[PDB]
Design a protein around this nucleic acid. Sequence first.
RNA 1: GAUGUGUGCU
DNA 2: TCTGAATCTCTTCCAGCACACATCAGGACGC
DNA 3: GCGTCCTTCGGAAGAGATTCAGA
Lengths: 98, 1358, 50, 79, 49
Amino acid sequence: HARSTGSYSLVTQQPLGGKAQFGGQRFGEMEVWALEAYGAAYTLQEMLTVKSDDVNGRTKMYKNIVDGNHQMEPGMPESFNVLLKEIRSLGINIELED
Amino acid sequence: EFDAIKIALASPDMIRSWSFGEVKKPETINYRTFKPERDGLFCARIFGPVKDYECLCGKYKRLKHRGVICEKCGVEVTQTKVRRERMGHIELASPTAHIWFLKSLPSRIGLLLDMPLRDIERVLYFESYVVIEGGMTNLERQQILTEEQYLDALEEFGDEFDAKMGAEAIQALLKSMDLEQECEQLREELNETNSETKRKKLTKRIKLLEAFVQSGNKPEWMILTVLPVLPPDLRPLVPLDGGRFATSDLNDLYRRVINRNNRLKRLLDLAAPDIIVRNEKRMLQEAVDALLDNGRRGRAITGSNKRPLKSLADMIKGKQGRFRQNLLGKRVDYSGRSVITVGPYLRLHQCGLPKKMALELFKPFIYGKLELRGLATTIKAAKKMVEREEAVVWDILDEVIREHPVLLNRAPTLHRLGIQAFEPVLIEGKAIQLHPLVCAAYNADFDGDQMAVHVPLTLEAQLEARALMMSTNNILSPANGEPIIVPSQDVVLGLYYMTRDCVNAKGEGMVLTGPKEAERLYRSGLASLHARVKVRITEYEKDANGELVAKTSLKDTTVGRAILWMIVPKGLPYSIVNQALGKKAISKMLNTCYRILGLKPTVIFADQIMYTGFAYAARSGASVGIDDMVIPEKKHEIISEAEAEVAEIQEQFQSGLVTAGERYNKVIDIWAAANDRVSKAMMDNLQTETVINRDGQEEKQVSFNSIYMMADSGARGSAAQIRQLAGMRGLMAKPDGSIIETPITANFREGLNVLQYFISTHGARKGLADTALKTANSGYLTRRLVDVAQDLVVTEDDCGTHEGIMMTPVIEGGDVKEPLRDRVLGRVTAEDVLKPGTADILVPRNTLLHEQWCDLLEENSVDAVKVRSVVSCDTDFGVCAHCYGRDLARGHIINKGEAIGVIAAQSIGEPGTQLTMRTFHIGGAASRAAAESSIQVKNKGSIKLSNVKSVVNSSGKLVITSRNTELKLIDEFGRTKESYKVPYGAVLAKGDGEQVAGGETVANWDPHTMPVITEVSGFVRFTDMIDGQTITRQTDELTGLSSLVVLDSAERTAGGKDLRPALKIVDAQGNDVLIPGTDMPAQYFLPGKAIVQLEDGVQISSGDTLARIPQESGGTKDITGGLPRVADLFEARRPKEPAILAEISGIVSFGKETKGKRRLVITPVDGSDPYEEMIPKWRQLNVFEGERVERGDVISDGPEAPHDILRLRGVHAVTRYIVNEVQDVYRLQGVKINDKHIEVIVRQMLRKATIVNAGSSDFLEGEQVEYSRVKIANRELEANGKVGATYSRDLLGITKASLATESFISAASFQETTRVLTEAAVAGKRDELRGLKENVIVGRLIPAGTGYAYHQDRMRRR
Amino acid sequence: DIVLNPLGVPSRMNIGQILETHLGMAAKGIGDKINAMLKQQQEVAKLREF
Amino acid sequence: ARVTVQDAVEKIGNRFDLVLVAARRARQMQVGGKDPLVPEENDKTTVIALREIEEGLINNQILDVRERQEQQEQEAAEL
Amino acid sequence: RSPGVFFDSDKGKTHSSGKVLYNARIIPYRGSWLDFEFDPKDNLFVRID
RNA sequence: GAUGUGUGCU
DNA sequence: TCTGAATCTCTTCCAGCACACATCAGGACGC
DNA sequence: GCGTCCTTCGGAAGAGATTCAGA
Ligand SMILES: [Mg+2]
Ligand SMILES: [Zn+2]
Ligand SMILES: [Zn+2]
């Protein structure tokens, strides 16, 4: 199986999972500690934003890759905004300071 | 953008500010033309447009009308992705209590209103009343009234006083309460009171009040007035095949809440009867509780077929929530997955990507170059060209895949070597060829496992893969400095068959002119590969300052070793291939090649070694037949001896010599001894069975048997597995851990019985159940080790400290398990070590001592080097490079900005997981020891006995009556060379300070049945032991002898629980004898399950056995049974019977007698003497009325709790204790872990420090605040004339030390999300995004590696 | 037709595969002898005897 | 034409600042029109950047001073 | 498990004192359980469902 | 999308 | 008869990745 | 066929609530 930029999930804008569906392999929690141990911070950042939950940077990176330029402009993962909204749906107020 | 994340309670005004509307109808999409309802859970007016830039009614359809609000249906035209950013709200008819602040312990409402949880729970659910504003009557402000009491108070006190039930009354209580007045009243009461429980409760309530008053939170905000709703795009309704809709849980809960709210609102307008409206309010409360956190109340409501639907908390907490499933680990694009094959033609920096997989991974990269070269003009033309797979696409793929490394990751990524970067080599196929050297690192065989490919996109990612994650730069394990790309199981067989000799050849006496001549003779067939010839070899040496000086000689070698010498790089001595190379030998060869030459020669050497191992293993035909498993001719004689011994054991047991718990142990011991004797016999029959002529008469040599070859070479096998083929299989182990009573007396070359196979199946199923059912509690260990040490990185270069722990070789029962070199290699020392040419320094203070310095230290034979440790570092928020040591993955000091706390956690956490997933490779063998009974000193020297309280024997010898004694052997020089732990009640054939010949017994004892031997003589009286009550007694009337077994706490009666059975030694005249030197009578207690073969009132001698205690210590002793101990050490669990230590030094004496438990008073010579300790009657005391003790000395005996050690013997003692215990547990299994990682974990366990006195600082009296903040405040105050604050270090387990951190995001994402978020919301905490998990969750660069410089720039920018 | 790895046999004690290999070798040897006796048409007596 | 970058790490002894320096140089060589200082052998920009690092004639100081010089030259060309 | 009465043990880890309790479960093929069990103070407590 | 079952490698 | 010690009771945790299949989604009653 | 609707059962550990006992 292989997967480039394809179909993404609905609630959290992440790539789908599976082979029947065109889905990307899960870079799980235990695989993130492996990139933290090396000190690979740009690789991890592109792993969890640029080809993941982040939406605008995901398309900007695709255009850059088919533009001759291998550079990322990451934003914020969508699943973190989902987490903030789900906390705010309780009686809890969570927000990002300035 | 942002720099902090603040969490707090949400006021109803703020909830209304969030909301863009008010959902007031329980109607989703109408199961029709897919449009939202009027004001339901989905609404274009409230939340947002369903379609992008299109009005719902059909009036505005384009971007030319952007921003306007329609009039027909009132929905503003905007981007449709605003349906996941605009929340709503529900105006509840009645107030409703938040379940998180009610049923999470401790209840915030409970200890804010000072009421028990039961009373407020009955008030909220309309089962009792609460007296608000009691007034001029006999009712208090928090009294609980039932229905009858409420009616009575209404009939006889029908004044303006009112008492309500439900959440409205609780909200009135919270709003009508003053916080500052209550806080000062509580402070007054706390200062007045003296009981510790009342003090703790009052200070907990004071802390809650201070957290409420300091933050902007209010008590009345914990009762919900308006309930916000999640945006619809975060709870979507996906239409299935047909007219139905998906079963959403949040929508169902919202519909229930809206139904209840609308029903209550309707009933509030028609003036319904009181019981009906109260029941409806209770139903609304239950619906809101089920929406917020379903299942925390009595019964979780279920949607369909009895399964509880997930609430707003079940999708934020747990393993399947937005924290561990979508934020700490995500699915990624540019990724692939396929099985793996060998492809041994590769190099260490190469892998094989299938030609049809790299085209789909590097697809945008192919698009870019196709548009650049002009073969396409748009993106669709290039997309179709790639889809068609034209002849020009493959050349573009070759051009874009040239130097673009990809990441190969196997499914369990235990350590950091599970992700590595390879330069792809396009192959035709569908399997990812993986280099055979990295299979050990991946722990990946080729029996059907798959690996995932990941494509680094950016230039920074490609350079991180090429410079950090490259498989070329991963030749050393990060846990220990041993090489990790080690040839395994075929290259070692090739190099062992090559570098070997037999005493004959095609040509043996010939003398050659070089290795090329040897290769030419082997290839031409004129000389065997195992000749013994003399080759002329020019070896180089860099003994100078990097100059290779040749030294040509004529050495007695073989042809195979000479052929192998052609690949050894220049600079290495010839005395590394001139031997029979196994796996350890060539692992050492690669290690010394890396330590001498560098990285590039080591990688080229590894590739050449793999090639020449595969070639010469192919050229040998090292098969395996059925005649290669040679059965020894004397196995059944050893079987007969052991079965006769077992028959004698049975006859002794049935007579009554031993019980049923000792027959088990002795039969296990005798069968394990017989199994080892059979294994030794078959190994001796295998290893040397090669009688071959020397060209004259017969001669002996090491065997060429294939089984023995691949067992001795270390290729694949050991003594156990090979023993089970030709010796005897032995005895199995059950899943519970118990060893099977009966052994199997057949091997896997003969058959097995229909019954022996059934017996073996117990161990076989144990081995397979252990992995799949108990690697969970070892993956849990590494997860909560990572989550406690994630935020530890190297932030400095040198803190400038002279402190540090002491390093000595560990000899704790045998020979040198780890010499000083292994424990001190690559760690910066703390003081100038003094050789035994004393008053002269050997090494400087701050030198990172490498292999040359270790050789220098071992030359002078040093025994103790004070080395700098992580736990003793003085840096704040991180460690320095010198206090950590060597990277252990490269041969230099650790770089600034390296996540060492994650490398430490992985290194500790995955020998356990890996070895508990590999427990079945030995099948189900018991793998237990033989229960060694005697001490045979092998070396020559004197003896030194430590902490011994011994007395005389009836034969005059010495008998040990001390628990923690150690028999250590000191040679003629004065250094310790051997050490042994002798047990209680063990006789001594020799004493202290006398030279012992090498190879004779010194201490003998029984491995089981520990005695209770005395020290004085006289008659013994059966004190406090009567038949039936405290002892089970059975009498042989023929002999008239009684053998009573004192029962344990289980079968002993409740009335006789305070009865303590013991043996008072008495003289002839009824007087109590005295322990020599003391005045305490010789009273000796007897624990449970103890048998006594003596009668009441029998004369004894000094130092003889009065009673026996069986040990029943039976276990398979794998890494599965043996790793709850590491979890206990890291979680700092107090043992059952803690050893009593001395809190304060001074003279020890007793005062008052029998306060239920004994009283001991310690009085120093100069200072204050306020200390008294309550010692229970359980354990005796090793100190007496007139001795001198120091803090940390043991008043009693038992396992030391790792908190008394911290608070008495200091930080160094507790960290050394934890390191030694964990290292012993791991070393029992052969695991090799450097102690830097355990020291890092201990340091992460040591971050809290309770204040003792406030001083001039701003801290409180007994607050638990982080030690780094205390050190910063004290160092800042001591700069001025102010006095600092005295503290006390605390030790928390890896769970508590991670759940009690300053960042609520890490704690919430680790465990107990509801409990962490509730406390964070109440206290109004503000996260600073300081760790690694926080930046991973947020979506930034970790402040660990290449992002460390960027984070330093950002931090110093503001 | 197939070349396996010897070292898979000692580590995991599946010695039954080696005995199966030897017994299959014997079976195919018997089949080869029958095929040799049958390829050149011999009388039924020799086939029955073998 | 690159396998191991140990020599480049010896040139810039951090192995973490080396990644940033090589990334900056490769970005200058890929997006910007700056030609490589060493003869390219059909290698990608990252490999050429690493080769310039390990050949000695580039580092963070050299890149910063050259960037400042070219920026001041552009400033002088403003007229 | 077949329907009937089974006298289990609950041996050991209960009450943290080593005292082995004793319980009897009456499992029907269809119906409610009738669990009897012992107390650490030697009392007989029935427990339905 | 979630459940339920089976399965592969650790 | 007040306050530590013990016991009782409630709570939260129990590895990773992947593949295949089916089934659900209101089903009762009014129309 | 359209369509509005309103069981019980593991197991170790930890915290916080009772409850004992003992001076
Ligand atoms: Mg495998
Ligand atoms: Zn409209
Ligand atoms: Zn330091």
